[PDB]
Write a protein that binds this DNA or RNA. Structure first.
Ligand SMILES: Nc1ncnc2c1ncn2[C@@H]1O[C@H](COP(=O)(O)OP(=O)(O)OP(=O)(O)O)[C@@H](O)[C@H]1O
Length: 152
RNA sequence: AAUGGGUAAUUAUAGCGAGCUAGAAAGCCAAAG
C-alpha cells in the first residue's frame, strides 16, 4: 500500500499516463486476491480482476453510446437478466501467419546468423504488440481489453 | 628252481586371460560485418 501511495500522488489521469497505471497493478497487486470471504473466487488476483472489469466497463459504454441510450439504471439495474442474455460483446482476435517462414529464414552461409534470429522473433513480437496497440486507439480502447498477446 | 618276460600309475598341475593414455582435432562454413 505504501508502494501505491508513492506513485499515485505525483500522477495525472490522461491517455499519456493511461498505461503506467496498469503495470503499477500488474506488478504490485499481481498476487493479491479479491473478495477473500468466498468459496469460489479464490484465485482471481486484483491486478487481473481490475484489468478485466475496466475492459468490460468501457465496452458497455461503446455498446450503449452507439445505440443511443443515456440513462444507465433501466438497462443495467432492472434489465440485468436481459443484459445477461443480450449479446453485447465481441471477442476479437488475430493470428499473424507466416511467422516461422519469417523467423527461420536463416540458411547456411547467412552473414548475420544469430543476431538476425534474435531480431526477427523480437520484431514480430513488437508487430504483434503494435497490432494490439494500434487497433485500440483506432477504436476508443486500450490495453485492458487485450486478454492476451503471444506469438502472433 | 631254471627259463621266458616286464607290469601298473602319471601325460602337466595352479594362476593371470590384458591394463593405462588418446575417443577425433584444425580448416572451409560460421564468426568479426
Ligand atoms: N513469434 C514467435 N516466435 C517463435 N515461435 C513462434 C512465434 N509464433 C508462433 N510460434 C510457434 O509456431 C507455431 C505455429 O506458428 P504458425 O505461424 O504456424 O501459427 P499459425 O499460422 O496460427 O498456425 P495454424 O495455421 O496451424 O493455426 C506455434 O506452435 C509456436 O510454437
Amino acid at each position: 500500500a505504501t508502494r501505491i501511495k508513492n506513485e499515485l500522488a505525483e500522477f495525472e489521469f490522461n491517455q499519456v499516463q493511461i498505461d503506467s497505471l496498469l503495470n503499477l497493478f500488474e506488478a504490485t497487486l499481481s498476487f493479491v486476491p479479491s473478495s477473500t470471504n468466498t468459496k469460489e473466487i479464490a484465485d482471481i488476483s486484483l491486478a487481473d480482476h481490475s484489468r478485466l472489469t475496466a475492459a468490460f466497463a468501457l465496452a458497455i459504454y461503446d455498446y450503449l453510446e452507439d445505440k443511443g441510450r443515456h440513462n444507465y439504471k433501466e438497462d443495467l439495474f432492472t434489465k440485468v437478466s436481459a443484459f445477461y442474455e443480450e449479446e453485447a460483446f465481441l471477442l476479437a482476435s488475430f493470428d499473424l501467419s507466416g511467422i516461422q517462414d519469417f523467423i527461420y529464414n536463416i540458411n547456411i552461409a547467412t552473414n548475420g546468423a544469430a543476431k538476425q534470429l534474435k531480431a526477427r522473433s523480437l520484431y514480430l513480437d513488437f508487430m504483434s504488440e503494435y497490432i494490439a496497440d494500434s487497433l485500440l486507439d483506432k477504436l476508443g480502447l486500450n490495453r485492458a481489453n487485450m486478454l492476451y498477446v503471444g506469438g502472433g
